[PDB]
Amino acid sequence: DNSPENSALVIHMYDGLLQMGARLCPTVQLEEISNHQGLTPLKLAAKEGKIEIFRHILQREFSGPYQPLSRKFTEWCYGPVRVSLYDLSSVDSWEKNSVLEIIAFHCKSPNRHRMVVLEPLNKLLQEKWDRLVSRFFFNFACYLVYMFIFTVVAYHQPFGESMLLLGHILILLGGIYLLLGQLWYFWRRRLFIWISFMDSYFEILFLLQALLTVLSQVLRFMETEWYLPLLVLSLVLGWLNLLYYTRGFQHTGIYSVMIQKVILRDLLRFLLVYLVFLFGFAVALVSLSREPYRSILDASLELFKFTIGMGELAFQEQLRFRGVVLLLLLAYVLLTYVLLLNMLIALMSETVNHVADNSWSIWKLQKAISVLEMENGYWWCRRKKHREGRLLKVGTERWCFRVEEVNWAAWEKTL
Amino acid sequence: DRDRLFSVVSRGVPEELTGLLEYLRWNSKYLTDSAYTEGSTGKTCLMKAVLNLQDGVNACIMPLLQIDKDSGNPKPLVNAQCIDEFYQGHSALHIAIEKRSLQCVKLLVENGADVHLRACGRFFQKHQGTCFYFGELPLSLAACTKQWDVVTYLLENPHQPASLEATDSLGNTVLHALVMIADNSPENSALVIHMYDGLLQMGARLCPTVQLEEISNHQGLTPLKLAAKEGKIEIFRHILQREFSGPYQPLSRKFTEWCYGPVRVSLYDLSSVDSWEKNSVLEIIAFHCKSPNRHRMVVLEPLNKLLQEKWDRLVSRFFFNFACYLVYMFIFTVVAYHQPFGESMLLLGHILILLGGIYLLLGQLWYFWRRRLFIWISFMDSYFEILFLLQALLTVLSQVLRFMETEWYLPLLVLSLVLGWLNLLYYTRGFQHTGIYSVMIQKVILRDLLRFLLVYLVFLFGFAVALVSLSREPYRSILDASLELFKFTIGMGELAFQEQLRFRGVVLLLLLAYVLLTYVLLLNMLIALMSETVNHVADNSWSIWKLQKAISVLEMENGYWWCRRKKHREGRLLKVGTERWCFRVEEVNWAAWEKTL
């Protein structure tokens, strides 16, 4: 457990058992045994969200006869700077079900954004991101060019005929490409969408957009006009998808945006309440109208348009019983004002209590997910095989990773 | 390498086996000039020997004497790493000092060690890799590591003494190095203050003729000016007001004259004064400094009173300039309004407007020439200087367009009118408006304007394109639809897209989607803005107002561009023998008086 006393007790017992097992049985390695799920103790700790024991296992050092069973080997320290040599087997390359892959996709605890900031994983992810930012921006540019072509073709379609036909063919090809890519992604990552829809909804939207545009092209070949609406949708949604790329050119994303995006767990209840209000009052009003307003849809749309300031009520005219229609309208207006005020207060209560100034960790987690996904390469041509090379083997026979730390506080406290 | 792997026998007699093996290679007596220095790429045997630290007393004296008794020409210490990899001149004496081994450095300086030669650890570039900066000198390294014994041995070393005024490649001295590594944490501040005072006293004792605090680096900054520029408030404050009783009285900056009760009359020291000195402490704090702490540095005891006196002197000219600008604005407004005997009045008004525009343009051009870097560093509290300039430029252009007999002067002139009135708000800081911390909160949140503007532009120009695409079977223009949606957003118009358009069920969906998205965006804006006022109370509007007044008085002490003011008079208070231009300040502290008895 994350409580300090439980963490201390479990750490002490873990180290004692490891040392005793090394002393009695020096030939067997107890930390390489996997359960029926195929998880070692380190991977299990990463998956279950136990941050304290996971961190302790990740960076532990022993001096003396217990040196071999250590994961961090301090090489040399000058001043407040220390050059340590951490150990791998938590690396994406050459290994399936890595620690980083489990943290990003399989883990579901709220602490997963605080686990990517640990010392070896931080530098590993930073190096991978610095390597792959070029492909990230190349993909951005390709999508932007596709969107410009799509917008121009849609706008200029009320020598030129050949250009329009070529544009339509390219739009169909791009839609097919995006559809296939998103289908492959959803095939590979079925469970991640269910676990963590909060930070993976864009993968849905893209797919949807692709599907829509493909359908539109089909409707253009059947000589029906109904292609025009769908295509228009496929336009606007596409532009919104560009916002997905705001995470590559250094936009933190703000903690407040996360606050609103997580408050939408309360959308269902408020939506149900508002729907009950709207479809009770509309039915009452159309019942008074009988002696047109025959449709429930007409009255509901009129009230909804008034609510968002898009129209006027205009129910006050005639209707004979003009003293009751007024009462119903005022009751509806007051109730919806109360509901909106309740929405606002419920939303705002979080920002005045939980400061949680940790946008950097969330941005790092987003970058980690992006680089993990794009290391596999494109669906039509899988990338070159994941090279295990992170740093040369050190005898300490172990694939290691050199990290440099600076700590003025620790240097000043010691003497 | 080879010697290291042959020196793996720690216990026993390792002093003689290496000597027997080495001698003079037993075959090349005179070939050791260059064939000896090839064991590694810079890590010589001596560095490994002093880096071992395997035993309590490492075997280092006798091998050094053995090499000294037979080799006199090949100095090993003078050789340094010529390759960027594996340090760039890191001598073994630095390792000896920093491993807290007085014996090792003592034995090294017994024979052949050259102190204060070079370290090239990190100055500006080249040697990098999150390295350690300590002034790249052995004495500076000893001082920064809190090693009094090493420093004491180095200063009065009988063999080779180390000068305390030595400068490194960057021009810094030991005091500059202590200033650079300073941090606002209490323990770091206490350590650096103690080391600074100890070094100052020791330098006074050993060398009473030199003054270490008047030495400037390549940038021309003394330790006090460097501390002011780098934003290290603690050491800057300690240096600003320090007093010593006894033989160390002369090297003090504050001299308490007389105290009655809770009131004390102290006599602070200058050389932080604007007048008679270029690159003063106040000038550096106001313009060159960029740390967030600059608004907390102007409230210190001598600077506060100095700035208050200067403001009390120059408020008259401040309000005179205000009155002149107000009169100019009234003339401009009347001339613009009454232009659909009188002809002569209108011509005179136009001539005066042209002259005022030229005057303002020249003044702002002079200001921008003098203060190029300040605009880039601190645009947050200096944007008015831009606006004025812009306005001036505009009005001048308008006058030109009036002489070409084109009507296009009328729009520009109108702009030059409205902007001018807004510029009057600049003068609200003179007649005692604090400005409110909340206004600063909004003015600093506009760092987030670019992201929200990009998001809103994407929304608007996606939805407008979709709507005009549906309109085709007028609304032909993207600009028309974008303007219509934008006008609806700010409550300036109505949508009116619901009429006809055949596909009336999709236009409605697009409009509702746009409205909901823009409401969500505005709510996000509001929550992001308001989150700061409920967490950071920061009730320090007085300091920000003092900083604004300081910038204003600093700028206006120079006088007008057409006639520079009378030369800055050094006179702040008469010279006191304590021969030093001083400044008398009176403090009252009931808490300190009550605590003491």
Author numbering:
A (entry chain D): 258 to 415, 429 to 561, 589 to 693, 701 to 719
B (entry chain A): 76 to 415, 429 to 561, 589 to 693, 701 to 719
What did the authors write?
Here, we combine calcium imaging and patch-clamp electrophysiology with cryo-electron microscopy (cryo-EM) to explore how TRPV2 activity is modulated by the phytocannabinoid Δ9-tetrahydrocannabiorcol (C16) and by probenecid. Each subunit harbors a transmembrane domain of six transmembrane segments (S1–S6) with S1–S4 forming a separate voltage sensing-like domain, while S5-S6 and the intervening pore helix (PH) form the pore domain that lines the ion-conducting pathway.
As expected, the two structures obtained in the presence of C16 displayed relatively open configurations compared to TRPV2apo-1, in agreement with a functional response to the ligand. However, the size and shape of the density does not completely match C16, which may relate to the limited resolution and the C16 occupancy. Consistent with C16 binding, residues H521 and Y525 that line the C16 pocket rotate considerably between TRPV2apo-1 and our two structures to provide space for the compound. The putative C16 binding is at a different position than that proposed for CBD in TRPV2CBD, which however is a closed structure and retains a lipid in the vanilloid pocket.
